[PDB]
């Protein structure tokens, strides 16, 4: 693995240092339908005219990005996405901007968000949840080795491809950092206690988030929930965790080690790093090489009827894409 990782880092750095820009333009696509929205942008299913291929276009209104104070975060988003390459990360196909917006054109992952399936079915069986988790574990290993923190792990940012595997999207809060950082960001239910307490944090927040993800997948609901974010934070900081009666002893043990407030005891942040997680009893049946190679048996394969089918996604109110005759925030987004 340390062999593979070294080459990966060489590959990443070349791209991080000389990022690609302006690799397409708006009139080369036909906007079809919104696939999903977040606090910052909207992602539409689009079709590329010359090739006939479908893609998922993320649209960011430059004025909104500024108001919400996400200028640096958006630059991080694009700069990182174009440099990474891993089997479980969505691919950035093209990127560009115009007077009003910023655009990130990704490969279309037609299986839908994990969120939707998870809430529909209620929860995933342990082997099913384990299959997704192993993939996230190998992805954070790859990302962390490049000095990258992900910061927004949640079912809503995970998509299922045609083979039934995971594809991570939304690098909105992804940042390349050596040392600590202080930005209060993410999603309430998944924030680690260090973040909420304004003490400065590192990669270990991603491992706490994995603990939260595994718990939600296998339980069907999060470990810390309430009606308002402030109440949620109180529960996270207290640390008390309660497990459903069907959780296996192995699962509970792993989770107590991930949802660990003491960052000097939290799995993933110890001497053995990621190996403490890989060698855990809960992951004994996991063939780590087979998973990376996609040779493992996918528990659930989404049904898809032809290219361009959006049946695995919810419907969203459509909104006209506006583009001023005047350039907006030109300097701020120069490198994009």
């Amino acid at each position: 693995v340390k062999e593979f990782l070294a080459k990966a880092k060489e590959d990443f750095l070349k791209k991080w240092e000389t990022p690609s820009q302006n690799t397409a333009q708006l009139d080369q696509f036909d906007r079809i339908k919104t696939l999903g929205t977040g606090s910052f942008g909207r992602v539409m299913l689009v079709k590329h005219k010359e090739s006939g291929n479908h893609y998922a276009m993320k649209i960011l209104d430059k004025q909104k990005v500024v108001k919400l104070k996400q200028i640096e975060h958006t630059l991080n988003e694009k700069r990182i996405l174009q440099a990474v390459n891993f089997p479980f990360l969505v691919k950035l196909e093209f990127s560009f901007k115009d007077n009003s917006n910023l655009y990130m054109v990704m490969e279309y992952v037609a299986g839908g968000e994990m969120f939707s399936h998870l809430r529909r079915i209620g929860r995933f069986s342990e082997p099913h949840a384990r299959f997704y988790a192993a993939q996230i574990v190998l992805t954070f290993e790859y990302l962390h080795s490049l000095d990258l923190i992900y910061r927004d792990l949640k079912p809503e940012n995970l998509l299922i491809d045609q083979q039934g595997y995971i594809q991570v999207t939304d690098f909105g809060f992804a940042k390349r950092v050596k040392g600590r950082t202080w930005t209060l960001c993410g999603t309430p239910e998944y924030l680690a206690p260090e973040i909420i307490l304004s003490k400065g944090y590192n990669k270990a927040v991603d491992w706490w988030a994995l603990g939260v993800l595994i718990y939600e997948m296998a339980a069907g609901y999060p470990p810390f929930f309430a009606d308002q974010p402030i109440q949620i934070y109180e529960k996270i900081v207290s640390g008390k965790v309660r497990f459903p009666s069907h959780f296996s002893s192995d699962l509970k043990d792993l989770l107590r080690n991930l949802l660990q407030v003491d960052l000097t005891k939290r799995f993933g942040n110890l001497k053995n790093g990621v190996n403490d997680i890989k060698n855990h009893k809960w992951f004994a049946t996991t063939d780590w090489i087979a998973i990376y190679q996609r040779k493992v048996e996918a528990p659930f394969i989404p049904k898809f009827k032809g290219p361009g089918d959006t049946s695995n996604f919810d419907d969203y109110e459509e909104e006209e894409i506006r583009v001023s005759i005047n350039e907006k925030c030109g300097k701020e987004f120069t490198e994009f």
């Binding site: 977040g38 606090s39 104070k69 809503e156 999603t187 239910e189 309430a226 009606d227």
Partner: peptide
């Protein structure tokens, strides 16, 4: 049950990131 309390909660839908 914990389930029933989550299902009756106001955070069962898609959760968007935090914005200041």
């Amino acid at each position: 049950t914990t389930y029933a309390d989550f299902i009756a909660s106001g955070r069962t839908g898609r959760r968007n990131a935090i914005h200041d």
